[PDB]
Amino acid sequence: TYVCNGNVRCVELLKQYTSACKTIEDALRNSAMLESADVSEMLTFDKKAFT
Amino acid sequence: YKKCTKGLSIADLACAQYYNGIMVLPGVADAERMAMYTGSLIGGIALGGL
Amino acid sequence: IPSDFAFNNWFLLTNTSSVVDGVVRSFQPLLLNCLWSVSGLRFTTGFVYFNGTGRGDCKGFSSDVLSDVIRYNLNFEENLRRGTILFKTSYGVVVFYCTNNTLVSGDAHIPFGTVFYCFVNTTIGNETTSAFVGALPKTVREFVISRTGHFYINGYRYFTLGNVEAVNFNVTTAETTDFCTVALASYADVLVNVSQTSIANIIYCNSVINRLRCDQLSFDVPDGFYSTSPIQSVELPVSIVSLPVYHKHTFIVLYVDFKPQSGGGKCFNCYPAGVNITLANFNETKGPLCVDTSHFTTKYVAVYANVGRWSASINTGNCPFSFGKVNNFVKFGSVCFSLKDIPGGCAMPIVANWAYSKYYTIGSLYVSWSDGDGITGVPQPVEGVSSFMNVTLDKCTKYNIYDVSGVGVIRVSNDTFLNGITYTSTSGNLLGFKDVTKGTIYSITPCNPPDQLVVYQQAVVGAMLSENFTSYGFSNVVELPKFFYASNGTYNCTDAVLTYSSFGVCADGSIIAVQPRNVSYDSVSAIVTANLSIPSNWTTSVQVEYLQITSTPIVVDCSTYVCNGNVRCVELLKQYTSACKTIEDALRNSAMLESADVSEMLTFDKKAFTLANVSSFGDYNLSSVIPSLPRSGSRSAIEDILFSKLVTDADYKKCTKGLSIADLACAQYYNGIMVLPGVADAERMAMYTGSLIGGIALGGLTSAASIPFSLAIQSRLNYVALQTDVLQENQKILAASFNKAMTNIVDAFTSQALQTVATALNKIQDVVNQQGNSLNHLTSQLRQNFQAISSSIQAIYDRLDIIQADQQVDRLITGRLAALNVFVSHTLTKYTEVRASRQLAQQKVNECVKSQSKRYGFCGNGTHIFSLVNAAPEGLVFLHTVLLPTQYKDVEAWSGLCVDGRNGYVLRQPNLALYKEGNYYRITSRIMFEPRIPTIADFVQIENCNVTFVNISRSELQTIVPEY
Amino acid sequence: AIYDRLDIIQADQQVDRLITGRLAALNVFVSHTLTKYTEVRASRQLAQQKV
Amino acid sequence: GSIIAVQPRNVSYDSVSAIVTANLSIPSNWTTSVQVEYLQITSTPIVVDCS
Amino acid sequence: NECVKSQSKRYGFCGNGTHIFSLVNAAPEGLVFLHTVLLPTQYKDVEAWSGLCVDGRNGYVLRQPNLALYKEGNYYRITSRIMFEPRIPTIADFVQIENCN
Amino acid sequence: GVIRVSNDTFLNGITYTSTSGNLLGFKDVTKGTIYSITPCNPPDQLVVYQQ
Amino acid sequence: CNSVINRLRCDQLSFDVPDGFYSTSPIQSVELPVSIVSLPVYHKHTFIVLY
Ligand SMILES: *[C@@H]1O[C@H](CO)[C@@H](O[C@@H]2O[C@H](CO)[C@@H](O[C@@H]3O[C@H](CO[C@H]4O[C@H](CO)[C@@H](O)[C@H](O[C@H]5O[C@H](CO)[C@@H](O)[C@H](O)[C@@H]5O)[C@@H]4O)[C@@H](O)[C@H](O[C@H]4O[C@H](CO)[C@@H](O)[C@H](O)[C@@H]4O[C@H]4O[C@H](CO)[C@@H](O)[C@H](O)[C@@H]4O)[C@@H]3O)[C@H](O)[C@H]2NC(C)=O)[C@H](O)[C@H]1NC(C)=O
Ligand SMILES: *[C@@H]1O[C@H](CO)[C@@H](O[C@@H]2O[C@H](CO)[C@@H](O[C@@H]3O[C@H](CO)[C@@H](O)[C@H](O)[C@@H]3O)[C@H](O)[C@H]2NC(C)=O)[C@H](O)[C@H]1NC(C)=O
Ligand SMILES: *[C@@H]1O[C@H](CO)[C@@H](O)[C@H](O)[C@H]1NC(C)=O
Ligand SMILES: *[C@@H]1O[C@H](CO)[C@@H](O)[C@H](O)[C@H]1NC(C)=O
Ligand SMILES: *[C@@H]1O[C@H](CO)[C@@H](O)[C@H](O)[C@H]1NC(C)=O
Ligand SMILES: *[C@@H]1O[C@H](CO)[C@@H](O)[C@H](O)[C@H]1NC(C)=O
Ligand SMILES: *[C@@H]1O[C@H](CO)[C@@H](O)[C@H](O)[C@H]1NC(C)=O
Ligand SMILES: *[C@@H]1O[C@H](CO)[C@@H](O)[C@H](O)[C@H]1NC(C)=O
Ligand SMILES: *[C@@H]1O[C@H](CO)[C@@H](O)[C@H](O)[C@H]1NC(C)=O
Ligand SMILES: *[C@@H]1O[C@H](CO)[C@@H](O)[C@H](O)[C@H]1NC(C)=O
Ligand SMILES: *[C@@H]1O[C@H](CO)[C@@H](O)[C@H](O)[C@H]1NC(C)=O
Ligand SMILES: *[C@@H]1O[C@H](CO)[C@@H](O)[C@H](O)[C@H]1NC(C)=O
Ligand SMILES: *[C@@H]1O[C@H](CO)[C@@H](O)[C@H](O)[C@H]1NC(C)=O
Ligand SMILES: *[C@@H]1O[C@H](CO)[C@@H](O)[C@H](O)[C@H]1NC(C)=O
Ligand SMILES: *[C@@H]1O[C@H](CO)[C@@H](O)[C@H](O)[C@H]1NC(C)=O
Ligand SMILES: *[C@@H]1O[C@H](CO)[C@@H](O)[C@H](O)[C@H]1NC(C)=O
Ligand SMILES: *[C@@H]1O[C@H](CO)[C@@H](O)[C@H](O)[C@H]1NC(C)=O
Ligand SMILES: *[C@@H]1O[C@H](CO)[C@@H](O)[C@H](O)[C@H]1NC(C)=O
Ligand SMILES: *[C@@H]1O[C@H](CO)[C@@H](O)[C@H](O)[C@H]1NC(C)=O
Ligand SMILES: *[C@@H]1O[C@H](CO)[C@@H](O)[C@H](O)[C@H]1NC(C)=O
């Protein structure tokens, strides 16, 4: 999306360099999921506290 | 963005981001649980093991 | 294709040098059409005409299709069978001679199996030429040739031909079991895993799962959220919106005259061609032409149907614009093309084809231009009426509005938008345009919004979409507010097997409102009358952590890494030493700094050495974590499993000799990336981890031996609170839970605890990925030449004389030093971050491990008992045993009662609280139900008695509290 | 518009120098995201550590 | 110039032990040793005019 | 503001041992400190009991973790876990426990 | 560099190159034997003491 | 700049280089016979000449 902009040809050429990009987007994705895990872990909910 | 790719309004800046692929994820501390949490703790300030 | 098919005879096909032991997605002719079983192929093999006439079974799926490719895989023993090879092709016949004997004619047999002067006669037109066999194949196990004519034998294609019609495998077979099969097949796209010259398996890229998996460049992609854009690329009508103007005729035209010399093989004397420009009339006074007005038009006309095998075309000369698309909404000003050559303009190459054998290059009119807005091109020849503004709204469209091209659906919008004709976004893509005729406006909605989808258990169930639609094989795909959720499976919403920050997902695909982990913690409260709950029966749960503690030390020689051993590059580099010298000095001193720091942390105790003995643990059977007993010499199961998973340190001295091909790490020495032996190398690192791990059950003592562990742990916990129990069942149940965490969690290697270990494992694999792709990012920045002709400095010297050699050499070194400073600055950011995390790790091993902190939320998410520790790839891992609430214990608590007399009690220290279990009073802790005997040492006097409080005199206080 | 301007071969040439530069800036951005992650990690430690 | 197997700094620290019958060692006669530290506390403020 | 003003109760923080106080000066764009500290130089032998409980229903456990008895002679003294200081024995640090071994 | 005789089938292809792109070894056309390439000038690390 | 010490010191662009570990590649640059490995093909005469 960010580089092809929806272009099929740019997609085909990009795919051969996936390893770099795939690594990039995997890093940011896993780190997003990591930090989301971390926050969710911090997140707690109490029925006593609600009221 | 699902609701801004239709309708009679010109898309907002954030919607333009979806169009360009900068998918801004809904915030981890989205309003619902974030508020439930901030509330749970803020009540935990005057609430103790009881 | 069968699964588990060994296909050992089949092989990979590579244009360039073959890779080893890697997985790559690629296009291969793998859509097998007809097996065409050999069935003992005899001397009269037969001719294939690119047809399904194959003597074979179709194996169900992919039964029969137009056969696009023919291959000759060979399955036979190491035997010589008399044979000949004859090739039939459109150009003409090809015959192959050979002679096993040294004589050129010799004996006309191609060697079969392992292994001669052979020749080939190729007749083209009426001319016959002879080709030398040259190199003799050791053994041919798979042969291949295409229609397009590419020929690869196990890769490294020697050449490629024009095309072919038929073939014959003129092999006389003495053996009855000559072959199993020899087939025809068709192209496809697949992926390939080959290891150490042996293929493992492949994955067709058909399903959604297999599609994304192919994109993952692996097998069995793990569960998670991934982005897909499945929008159909099928061409659709494209609406045009334009600005009103009466179109003057500004369309370029062309003519050509190609003398028709025979386009067959025999073009010994073949004529050239002369083209005459048809764009406009030329007066030789002024060479350049002009534009009548600012209008959109361009066309190309030519005649090429003059020869049997001829095509004439132009690609691009020295100017960017590609002729023939000039009409595709291009805008220029006063380009003023001229046939006669003039400066400041590009030229265009013209070429003629004769079956690709020879290119009859000619040069047509060079094209000149000026930067402007007037000249323009439209695919339609005439737009003079100026009422043509094609418009499709809801359908997918391609659009050009006022020279802006995009793809999407036009949505009618009603807004004044009086500022200007059009508005573009921050990126620059137009959002909407107001119509010239009436002031109405149309927004542009993107045609192909990106889609997010979820795969679970190697299956895609559920997808996050913007449309209310069921796109799955299951039954129901519900809707949602402000956003939609796609899962075609039924919704019983029994329970959620997946959890994201803003949603939850059932095993069946039912969506659930994100529910945060429900936890009921207990916090201290002021002296009050209430019914209270204390944690009583705990069992221990390992909460695994991973701590970065160093980074892999790396040193780079300026000369090695940039010169590559080149003396000339060394001489030029030396003048810029100050920068590089500063760089390598910084990284070197910082390496020595961090090595000093670790060594300073490193300690060794003779008392501790022995403490790794298995006798100390007793019933605990910690064993796995226990450092192994010295094997008649002067390492734990987890560290070993982790090492066994080190997939995806030695001395290069021993790999620059020997019969083995060098390993990847050895290649690093060759390229000058001298990876230093790890500071915490195995020897002292292990001696240290052992010394401390024994220091956990070893305290300041005269001897160097162990103490019974059962009495020993009691002390670490006492730091948190005074144990008044004698018989510790918790020990044995925490051992059963601990070793069950090791059984199960170590099986996970090879309960929220499981989430913790999943996080830690993902963290270690993260740090291994980040280091791998860091140095791979470096060695790929060496794989790329910023501006050079090529990356090889040597080959550059071959290519170039000194002066311009130095020019591209130093632009290379400037870019390499730039990336190198980037890398050393990432090393410095890694140093400051590994310094913070060293502070923290060093800060917790010496505290939490040695003496439980009084800070809850630090280590253990509750009352903490002690922590284990081991080594890990470039980091530490700990196992903080802790005490948490499992069963609460009811109690009643008074409101800090003051005695009726002037005596009245307030708290002597905040961490205790009375309660009334019965007539007698006991003062259990705020962190356990331990029944501390009541005692005066914790009392205080306060006058003001609230009658609502205890009724006791100072005398029977002794009968109430056993103060003395 | 580059595809409109260009035939495949040199189209791929300017396309891939584009993507090389875009991936370069993109790695710059993901590395600033990683520096932001390590810093927001320190400050998460501290915030989480004070609440 | 003789090479030696890296020996880490030998140190015999003392850590607390649970109530037990044993012969124990307490530090008695100390003399003070300065352990110098250096702490970054600011950075050299710099301003640049675009023009 | 901490270690300098009031010695931390965290060993391994400042001084690599028992810490006494810290000096401070300025430096190019930074600070430098001189953390005076107390470290082991000469150990002092002692004998320590296994948290003995009295024969009567009275029996002793530790009132706070940082001390330890020892038997220097017939009389008992309760030196700290961080020094050989001879704290006079005292009831303020005692507790009762029935089970006598 | 110096060519070192190597004995391995290496049946995948004629030649193999490293991650950098420098060839590691090549198999002979005549007989299937292969030769590894060992770097001519390995970098050296040296220590200076008391000048 | 004759001795090893004075050689590295000249590279240090200073005097009395402090004690430490430094990288040197002293391999002789003297020209040596260079072996050639090639792919079998009967060479047609494709050599440019000049007058
Ligand atoms: C080693 O080097 C050699 C060269 O020395 C490489 O060989 C080349 O490889 C490329 C692909 O990497 C080949 O291009 C492909 O040609 C395929 C054959 O199709 C031919 O006929 C069809 C129908 O008439 C034409 O459309 C093709 O292309 C022609 O027309 C297009 C129009 O745009 C022109 O641009 C071309 O110049 C031609 O004039 C061919 O003549 C062809 O099927 C294939 O197309 C698929 O892949 C592309 C890219 O993804 C898609 O855009 C296209 O839609 C097809 O993709 C789908 O098609 C299949 C059909 O089964 C569907 O099932 C799937 O959905 C699939 O995704 C492409 O055009 C090139 O021809 C070839 N050179 C020669 C002469 O053989 C090797 O690849 C290389 N190997 C290594 C190891 O790198
Ligand atoms: C590519 O191939 C497989 C995935 O299917 C992975 O490597 C292969 O793993 C199999 C496991 O069955 C190995 O088979 C075993 O090899 C050992 C070693 O000789 C042998 O003792 C056993 O009897 C069994 O045959 C196979 O050798 C191995 N192939 C390799 C290493 O090339 C690998 O993960 C796959 N690649 C990826 C990353 O997809
Ligand atoms: C055989 O191949 C030829 C092409 O040479 C084709 O014309 C014919 O249709 C094929 N026959 C069958 C039965 O497929
Ligand atoms: C096969 O080759 C033999 C000799 O090599 C020849 O006698 C025979 O005619 C050939 N047959 C065909 C069908 O080419
Ligand atoms: C080509 O074939 C002819 C006869 O078919 C033969 O005389 C000639 O020697 C062949 N060319 C060679 C062997 O190079
Ligand atoms: C080829 O056929 C032979 C029979 O001669 C058989 O032994 C061998 O297994 C086959 N090779 C395969 C299936 O790869
Ligand atoms: C444009 O409009 C005309 C008439 O409505 C039609 O003939 C033509 O096909 C249309 N073309 C496109 C691309 O919309
Ligand atoms: C085209 O070619 C013919 C003959 O080759 C010539 O008479 C004519 O002037 C040329 N140009 C145009 C624009 O017709
Ligand atoms: C969503 O799609 C379903 C499927 O047909 C349809 O019944 C429903 O009316 C649609 N709702 C909206 C708001 O588009
Ligand atoms: C799920 O819902 C379907 C349809 O309402 C129902 O038939 C089925 O019994 C339900 N299953 C469970 C486990 O609730
Ligand atoms: C969290 O809340 C639900 C709501 O009633 C309750 O059933 C459950 O006991 C709580 N969680 C656990 C693990 O007990
Ligand atoms: C809970 O407290 C009330 C008074 O606050 C008391 O009467 C009751 O007995 C307590 N609960 C139990 C189980 O004793
Ligand atoms: C729970 O605690 C009580 C109190 O000591 C004990 O009697 C009981 O056996 C414990 N139960 C378990 C399962 O540990
Ligand atoms: C470990 O201790 C046991 C008993 O404490 C003893 O039998 C054994 O010899 C010890 N290990 C070694 C290596 O001596
Ligand atoms: C625990 O002890 C038993 C017997 O001593 C032994 O068989 C078992 O292997 C030990 N546990 C582990 C994990 O080795
Ligand atoms: C003290 O006791 C009185 C009853 O006489 C009551 O009204 C008041 O709330 C109490 N105040 C406290 C407990 O602070
Ligand atoms: C460290 O160990 C050696 C080994 O016997 C010992 O001689 C020495 O006393 C220790 N180090 C110091 C500084 O005392
Ligand atoms: C060491 O302890 C033993 C008993 O554990 C004791 O007999 C001995 O006297 C102690 N050492 C000294 C020097 O008193
Ligand atoms: C060591 O400590 C003892 C105990 O006070 C003291 O008498 C002796 O003088 C001290 N020695 C030194 C050198 O400080
Ligand atoms: C190449 O080989 C020939 C014969 O072995 C010899 O005359 C020539 O000098 C050699 N040259 C090189 C550069 O090895």
Curated annotation (Swiss-Prot), chain F:
Location of this chain's protein in the cell: Virion membrane; Host endoplasmic reticulum-Golgi intermediate compartment membrane
Family membership: Belongs to the alphacoronaviruses spike protein family.
Domain remark from Swiss-Prot or TrEMBL: The KxHxx motif seems to function as an ER retrieval signal.
Subunit note: Homotrimer. During virus morphogenesis, found in a complex with M and HE proteins. Interacts with host ANPEP.
Role according to the record: S1 region attaches the virion to the cell membrane by interacting with host ANPEP/aminopeptidase N, initiating the infection. Binding to the receptor probably induces conformational changes in the S glycoprotein unmasking the fusion peptide of S2 region and activating membranes fusion. S2 region belongs to the class I viral fusion protein. Under the current model, the protein has at least 3 conformational states: pre-fusion native state, pre-hairpin intermediate state, and post-fusion hairpin state.
Name of this protein: Spike glycoprotein
Organism: Human coronavirus 229E
Shown chain mapped onto the complete sequence: 915 to 1015 of 1173
Curated annotation (Swiss-Prot), chain G:
Disulfide bonds, paired cysteine numbers: none
Location(s) in or outside the cell: Virion membrane; Host endoplasmic reticulum-Golgi intermediate compartment membrane
Protein's UniProt name: Spike glycoprotein
Function statement: S1 region attaches the virion to the cell membrane by interacting with host ANPEP/aminopeptidase N, initiating the infection. Binding to the receptor probably induces conformational changes in the S glycoprotein unmasking the fusion peptide of S2 region and activating membranes fusion. S2 region belongs to the class I viral fusion protein. Under the current model, the protein has at least 3 conformational states: pre-fusion native state, pre-hairpin intermediate state, and post-fusion hairpin state.
Superkingdom, natural source: Viruses
Family the entry assigns: Belongs to the alphacoronaviruses spike protein family.
Recorded name of the encoding gene: S
Subunit organization: Homotrimer. During virus morphogenesis, found in a complex with M and HE proteins. Interacts with host ANPEP.
Domain notes: The KxHxx motif seems to function as an ER retrieval signal.
Lineage: Viruses, Riboviria, Orthornavirae, Pisuviricota, Pisoniviricetes
Mutagenesis / variant outcome for changing L24V: In strain: Isolate A162
